[PDB]
């Protein structure tokens, strides 16, 4: 059984054996179980916590997450796995977001995994994303939400077609971003001015 | 750059004349 040993160890060598099996399967995939393991741990996580016990043993938990992410990025065409991956990451982060857990390296690992997975998909609309970004800047905080929105807008501009611009609104959004000095500013400007002829000089 | 083992003998970037002839002799 898989869930049983997981819920027994934390509250040792078999985890290493699991890592070896994961690496060998990844080698077979690249040269040529992860779904089952992910489903089993998700079902265990649904039942009452495991994340608290994993936090004290984060040194052993984090390599499994890294192997799963390598498996996911190895086969981007394999849809569905990434959706379940992101869902599990968001659910376990939400269960771990209470302030009393003493968040640490596992928290940051989950946060970066969730952010990277969320950036992997497109956004619905450029204008809606810009309006939501402007609202977030009006709120002056939620820089994680701001980062997610700007990454989504950059991805949409990279993939999709240019939409309604409202150059006054674009200038206001860029002014707010310069006020907060977002790291994604250069990427955002490159995304905007590589397309969308609807005038950059004026902005 | 760094080296995994400092006292490793298999480092053959510098081959002396004796070892040069010895390698060529039987390869």
């Amino acid at each position: 059984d898989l869930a049983g040993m997981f819920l027994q160890i934390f509250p040792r060598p078999v985890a290493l054996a699991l890592q070896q099996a994961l690496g060998q399967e990844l080698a077979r995939v690249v040269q040529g179980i992860t779904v089952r393991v992910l489903q089993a741990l998700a079902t265990l996580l649904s039942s009452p916590a495991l994340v608290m016990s994993m936090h004290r043993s984060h040194f052993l938990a984090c390599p499994l997450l890294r192997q799963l992410c390598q498996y996911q990025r190895c086969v981007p065409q394999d849809t569905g796995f990434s959706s379940l991956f992101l869902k599990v990451l968001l659910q376990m982060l939400q269960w771990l977001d209470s302030p009393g857990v003493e968040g640490g390296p596992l928290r940051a690992q989950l946060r970066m995994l969730a952010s990277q997975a969320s950036a992997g998909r497109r956004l619905s609309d450029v204008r809606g994303g810009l309006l939501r970004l402007a609202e977030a800047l009006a709120f002056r905080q939620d820089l994680e939400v701001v980062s997610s929105t700007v990454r989504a807008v950059i991805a949409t501009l990279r993939s999709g077609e240019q939409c309604s611009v409202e150059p006054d609104l674009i200038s206001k959004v860029l002014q707010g971003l310069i006020e907060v000095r977002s790291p994604h500013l250069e990427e955002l400007l490159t995304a905007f001015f590589s397309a969308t002829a609807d005038k950059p000089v004026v902005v | 750059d760094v080296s995994v083992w400092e006292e490793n003998w298999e480092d053959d970037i510098v081959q002396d004349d004796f070892n040069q002839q010895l390698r060529l002799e039987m390869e």
Binding site: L16, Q20, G23, F59, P105, Q109 | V2, V4, W9
Partner: protein, 402 residues
């Protein structure tokens, strides 16, 4: 003096070829002379401040200032000029050139190195351009390689904060390389527990990118080996397990970058074992577990690392010898080209592990060699290692056969 006046005259000419030649000659003479350096410093200040000079010539003119290290006041005036430059010419090329020149000037003239590091950190945290950030990384790398002791706790705090905040993988990789370079010197002692550096190193050691993980685990290795504080003894397990994760990640990637990261990880665990024997036992255990499933080049590097481990630390456990013999058996019919170096490294670890005499396992080794090798040079190197480690009977058999 007449040569200096000729250099000064041509610098304000109209023919661009003559102006470029004058710039080169000014560089050389300012490298040599001292009075010429301050004169040219004043002329360059009033020229860059002037509007006649084109942008490209301004770019060519700035690195002349890197030779103003002849005295303190001249260097300080050049520093004011460079500050003016970065304020009033914020485009990419000339801020690049100017702050690189400031880095070189500070490296030469040690008086202004702290404020230069502070300015570099400020440009790293604030400036949004990727190229300017990457130059800041390279300049901090140069300063860390050239003067780690001058770094303060505040600078390391700022660098760790910058590493945590930035989302880009390349910038994170570079600044963590700078931090790792700092960690392999006395900068850790000057820095000092759980702090920003420790949290950053723990977070990065589990990062997806191979290089970031390598530099993070190297930071953890250095911080563990350097000092014996209680929190370091608490976190030393984290370094070991992250090192194992990197090992299993790089054991089958088979790329030159993967080879470099694997070399870094193996050197790190060799140093850690030299520092922590009770950790070295588990290090040996995981090395043997991953030896069987690793690729040929990974196995060669793993065997080199294990040989270093065994050579420095005597009590390795003869239980190792069984796994090495089993691995040697299966590798006997693995390949033909890369099998040679793997064979000699495996024989080396066999001899180093066998602190006592050999047995019929030596018969198995020589039988495998005679059956599969058919090369001789590898036989010679295995016999040489046997004579090195004192297994002289094996050496006698191989030399007689050869």
């Amino acid at each position: 003096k007449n040569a200096h006046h000729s250099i000064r005259q041509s610098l304000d000419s109209h023919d661009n070829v003559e102006v470029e030649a004058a710039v080169f000659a000014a560089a050389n003479f300012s490298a040599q002379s001292k009075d010429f350096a301050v004169g040219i410093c004043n002329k360059i200040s009033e020229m860059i401040q002037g509007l006649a000079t084109p942008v490209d010539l301004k770019l060519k003119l700035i690195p002349i200032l890197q030779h103003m290290h002849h005295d303190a006041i001249l260097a300080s005036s050049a520093r004011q000029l460079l500050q003016q430059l970065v304020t009033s010419y914020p485009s990419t090329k000339m801020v690049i050139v100017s702050l690189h020149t400031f880095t070189l000037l500070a490296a030469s003239s040690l008086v202004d190195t702290p404020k230069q590091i502070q300015l570099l950190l400020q440009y790293l945290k604030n400036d949004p351009r990727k190229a300017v950030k990457r130059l800041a990384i390279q300049d901090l790398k140069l300063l860390a390689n050239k003067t780690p002791h001058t770094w303060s706790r505040e600078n390391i705090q700022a660098l760790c904060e910058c590493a945590l905040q930035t989302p880009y993988d390349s910038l994170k990789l570079g600044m963590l390389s700078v931090l790792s370079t700092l960690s392999g010197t006395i900068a850790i002692k000057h820095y000092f527990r759980s702090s920003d550096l420790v949290k950053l190193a723990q977070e990065c050691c589990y990062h997806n990118n191979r290089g970031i993980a390598a530099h993070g685990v190297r930071v953890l290795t250095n911080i563990t080996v350097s000092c014996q504080e209680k929190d370091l003894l608490a976190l030393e397990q984290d370094a070991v397990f992250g090192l194992e994760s990197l090992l299993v990640l790089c054991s089958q990637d088979d790329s030159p970058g993967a080879q470099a990261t694997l070399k870094i990880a193996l050197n790190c665990m060799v140093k850690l074992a030299k520092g922590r024997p009770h950790l070295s036992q588990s290090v040996v255990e995981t090395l043997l577990t991953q030896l069987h499933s690793a690729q040929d080049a990974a196995r060669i590097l793993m065997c080199h690392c294990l040989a270093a481990i065994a050579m420095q630390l005597p009590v390795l456990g003869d239980g190792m010898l069984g796994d090495l013999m089993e691995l040697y058996k299966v590798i006997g019919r693995s390949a033909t080209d890369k099998q040679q170096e793997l064979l000699v490294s495996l024989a080396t670890v066999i001899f180093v592990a066998s602190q006592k005499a050999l047995s019929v396992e030596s018969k198995a080794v020589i039988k495998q060699q005679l059956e599969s090798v058919s090369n001789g040079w590898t036989v010679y190197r295995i016999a040489r290692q046997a004579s090195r480690m004192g297994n002289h009977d094996m050496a006698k058999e191989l030399y007689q056969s050869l």
